[PDB]
Ligand binder design. Structure first.
Ligand SMILES: Nc1ncnc2c1ncn2[C@@H]1O[C@H](COP(=O)(O)OP(=O)(O)OP(O)(O)=S)[C@@H](O)[C@H]1O
Ligand SMILES: [Mg+2]
Lengths: 74, 381
């Protein structure tokens, strides 16, 4: 599921490429952490939070790249 | 994820290369005399995996190096080969090899024959659900009877750590700082948007719009996590308590046990005689009874944060035959969902076991060899 990709971005951000970073919907990712499924201990929730912010961070950096190359091309 | 194979060399009594026959995914039991090499095997696994061995000063490193007459050793390594059928390890291999090499001036991990930091290793292990937090994957008799005799204050400290509040706080501080690191990049794209091939503008502004909704969702997430951080200790208490009572009733059929708060500490009240308001405080139980109850609590906590394998070094030492059989029956049940590697001197755990290993100390070194159920039972009696 999507919590799995979040789990990967928390601990092993290497095996995570642009394709997951762009495909990922943070709003639904976050929503599946907030709302049930199998209820999580606080420790796992903290990992998933760091994973969500990790992807948010990558999404922001990728947008920074496609900008600093489209403002240098036009 | 389970331990498929262990290779040891130069490590305490395992002076010479020691290639242990592949383990069962269920319950492996190891037998041998005092001084044969059983705890040394478990220390070899902990040397690779346990957070507490991750940093060592020279004085502790050389205590790991084999010492004795004959060939002097200068380096040691332990290698664990993980079976990765369930794909819990974020590496696309059926088998994952993790090796730690120790010398007086060297200390290096090799993940699948390639160098990795200590941080790589502990991140890898948490990826697969094997925390540097919950340190109950490995249990020792000294851990059990230390828990048998611990005060109520110790048990509350224990409960805090399984609640996870400390690491949650570290992840949040990590998250927030990384949030600040994006607010500067978000500023150098939103301010940078002034300039703007007409379609790519709308497609990029779509993605700016996406970072704006995600910022809001992240802020929402941080609120719900900060509110449950203050419910964690009470919620895990509730969870471990229920687990503890169910475990004890499986161990001691008509018995009853509960945890009680006080927040100052966590007490235990127990009745072996059968829910008859015969609730004794932990400290007034017998020696064996404290050790069974300590074990039930460990089993309850392992249930709050399960691991793919368990190492038990002499857990039934203080236990009589009735309570040993109960521990064995429980282990047989748990061993269908998790790997077990145990050592014992009594026959009850042997009934629970799918593979048997014998440890011998001969010619100044330890040896570990596959044996039969008959030989294990014969040794034990
Ligand atoms: N650095 C070392 N070099 C050589 N031998 C060691 C070293 N450290 C410990 N030993 C010895 O290795 C032998 C086996 O130790 P252990 O594995 O701890 O024994 P054991 O099978 O657990 O026996 P118990 O705990 O009495 S049932 C002991 O005699 C130790 O004194
Ligand atoms: Mg021992």
């Amino acid at each position: 599921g999507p919590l799995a990709k979040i789990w990967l971005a928390a601990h092993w951000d290497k095996k995570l490429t642009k394709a997951h970073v762009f495909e990922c919907n943070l709003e639904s990712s976050v929503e599946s952490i907030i709302s049930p499924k199998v209820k999580m201990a606080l420790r796992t929730s903290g990992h998933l939070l760091l994973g969500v912010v990790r992807i948010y961070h990558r999404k922001a950096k990728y947008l920074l790249a496609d900008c600093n190359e489209a403002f240098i091309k036009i | 994820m389970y331990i498929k194979q262990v290779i040891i060399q130069g490590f305490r009594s395992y002076r010479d290369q020691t290639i242990v026959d592949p383990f069962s995914s269920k319950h492996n039991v190891i037998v041998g005399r005092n001084g044969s090499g059983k705890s040394n095997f478990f220390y070899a696994i902990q040397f690779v995996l346990s957070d507490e061995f991750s940093h060592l000063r020279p004085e502790q490193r050389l205590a790991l190096l084999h010492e004795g007459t004959g060939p002097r050793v200068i380096s040691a390594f332990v290698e664990i080969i993980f079976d990765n059928s369930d794909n819990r390890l974020p590496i696309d291999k059926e088998e994952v090899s993790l090796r730690r090499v120790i010398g007086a001036k060297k200390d290096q991990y090799f993940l699948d024959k390639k160098m990795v930091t200590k941080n790589d290793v502990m991140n890898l292990l948490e990826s697969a659900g094997f925390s540097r937090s919950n340190p109950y994957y490995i249990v020792k008799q000294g851990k059990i009877n230390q828990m048998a005799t611990a005060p109520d204050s110790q048990r509350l400290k224990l409960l805090r750590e399984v609640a996870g509040t400390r690491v949650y706080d570290e992840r949040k501080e990590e998250s927030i700082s990384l949030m600040k690191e994006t607010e500067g990049k978000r500023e150098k794209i939103n301010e940078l948007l002034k300039y703007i091939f007409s379609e790519q503008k709308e497609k990029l502004i779509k993605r700016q719009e996406e970072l704006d909704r995600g910022y809001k969702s992240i802020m929402e997430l941080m609120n719900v996590l900060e509110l449950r951080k203050y419910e964690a200790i009470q919620l895990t208490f509730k969870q471990v308590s229920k687990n503890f009572s169910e475990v004890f009733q499986k161990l001691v059929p008509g018995g009853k046990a509960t945890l009680v708060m006080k927040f100052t500490g966590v007490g235990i009240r127990v009745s072996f005689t059968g829910k008859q308001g015969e609730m004794r405080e932990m400290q007034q139980l017998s020696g064996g009874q404290k050790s069974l109850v300590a074990l039930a609590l460990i089993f309850a906590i392992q249930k709050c944060d399960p691991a793919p394998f368990y190492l038990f070094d002499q857990i039934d030492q203080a236990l009589d035959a009735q309570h040993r059989k109960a521990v064995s029956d429980m282990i047989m049940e748990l061993a269908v969902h998790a790997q077990f590697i145990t050592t014992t001197f009594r026959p009850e755990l042997l009934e629970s076991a799918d593979k048997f290993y014998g440890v011998k100390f001969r010619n100044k070194v330890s040896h570990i060899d596959v044996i039969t159920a008959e030989m294990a039972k014969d040794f034990v009696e």
